[PDB]
Amino acid sequence: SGFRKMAFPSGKVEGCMVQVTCGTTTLNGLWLDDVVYCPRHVICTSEDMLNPNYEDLLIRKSNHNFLVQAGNVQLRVIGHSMQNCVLKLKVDTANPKTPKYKFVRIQPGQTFSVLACYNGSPSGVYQCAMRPNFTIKGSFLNGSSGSVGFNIDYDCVSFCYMHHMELPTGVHAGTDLEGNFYGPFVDRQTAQAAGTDTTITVNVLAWLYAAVINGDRWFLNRFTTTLNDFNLVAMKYNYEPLTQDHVDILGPLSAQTGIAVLDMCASLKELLQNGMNGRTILGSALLEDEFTPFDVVRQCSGVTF
Amino acid sequence: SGFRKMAFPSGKVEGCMVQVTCGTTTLNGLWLDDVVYCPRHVICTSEDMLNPNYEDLLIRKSNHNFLVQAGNVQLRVIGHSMQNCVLKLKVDTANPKTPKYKFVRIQPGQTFSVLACYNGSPSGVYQCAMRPNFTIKGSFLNGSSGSVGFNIDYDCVSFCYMHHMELPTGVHAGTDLEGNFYGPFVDRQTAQAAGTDTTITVNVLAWLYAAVINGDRWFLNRFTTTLNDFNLVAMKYNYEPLTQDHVDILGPLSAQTGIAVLDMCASLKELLQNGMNGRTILGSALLEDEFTPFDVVRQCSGVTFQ
């Protein structure tokens, strides 16, 4: 019993984190076999970040310009190649602790654990979500760019994110490990801003299902909605559309509790209209939206890796 | 910027986790060097549990009665002793991933990371506080006993909690890694019940400070209070007494932000009396009490000018 914001076991990712210096600029890198990925903005300095020519700055740079450290040990860079917004430094040594991995691009509303690093040194792990506006509300200080977010999908670490920059609102943008940014953001100091954030409806419903599983029934009601009308109400509370796809990934939880998804949408309809009125669900006074359906299943079945 | 419930990385602990089976009971062990620590209730059938005598049950066991597994690989048990409520199984191999480590008993209010495991494999990691009534509000299912809490100081893992059992209220009870229970709890099947739970007052303040550090100020005020007039209002809202030991650890956060502890205590007093009034602090509608001052410094602190 109980329900917590649970992070993935960060073990198999801690072995992959390294330091990458270039000038006086230090950030973090991900070491997988004989390649070290990091933000291409390690090459820039403070002037260049105002308006960078990455293709002309990587020219005036050679292998010896990149210092790469793995604990006490040093690593020898035997090539480079900037793909999109991420650097891939070929190095002479394969990481012994390289796990079975893949590179994924996640859709908004999908969650992942973030391993916050400084100086190639993991400091903490937390569970995050890709906001609808393609940011994440992370916890990052100066020098954490290159820290990575990930899932464990069965036996295989799925790298989904690499931190680049902090936007002015306090939120955070980055790339997949192919270097292609999430959202409209770009690696340069300009007047970028995040959109307005909205709530990830399908995750809220997942969490209401968790609450039912763990014994909370008060928010349930005989009322009934259609998919269309729910979205009309929800939309005025900054809730993301619930699609027919969404209604399917909720079908497992629908059948474990015998509550149709549309009946749960009616429960959520009334919580939006009437509020919560100083009541808690699963130790919470707000509607949590950072647990996916699969996150619920995992915590409630005791899924291991 | 930002502020999350941040767990310590769990790798150093992942490499220690093993599966311990005895009879029909399977649970988790901790493989440090050539010893496996696990809860001693693994040797009980549920008929003994009703009123067991543990040194009597342990002297009936053979080494071969313990199935210990690390991955596919069975470990050979060569000895078995008790220390309070934990079994030390001597195995024949030393754990090659054994981190630098140490066993520490924590106090109520302090926090730690928990690696929830089943069958010696980890399910995930989360931060917890030792509640003042010596329970924890974990997420633990059947098979989770043997899971451990831990803090990490540099390279060094300070194991502080081992999970044993779930109480009727759905909170969790366990021991330090020397076998002594946190709280008045016993590993036999009796009526047991958690004492009254209260809010860790020092921790809330640490979190109001973390809020001010992240640019929330809406809940501050010019009002100031005596420590005693606070506790008078606080106690009636189910809060722990605040005391100089607490004030003197907030000191750095009170200094980094410029807000005298006694002023932060007048902010909280007003939050208690008037409620939050449809507002949020660090994305929360409740006052959070599972962040210690140290978890705040850990997470959102930098260079200070002298």
Residue numbers in the entry:
A (entry chain B): 1 to 305
B (entry chain A): 1 to 306
Describing publication, verbatim:
Within the asymmetric unit, the C-terminal tail (Ser301-Gln306) of chain A inserts into the substrate-binding site of chain D. Additionally, the substrate-binding site of chain A is bound by the C-terminal tail of chain D from a neighboring symmetry equivalent dimer. This C-terminal tail-binding contributes to crystal lattice formation by connecting chains A and D to each other throughout the crystal. Our C145S construct terminates at the P1 position (Gln306) and so lacks the residues corresponding to P1’ to P3’. Thr26 and Thr190 form H-bonds with Ala233 (P2’) and Ala228 (P4) of the hNEMO peptide, respectively. This causes the distance between the Cɑ atoms of Thr26 and Thr190 to decrease.
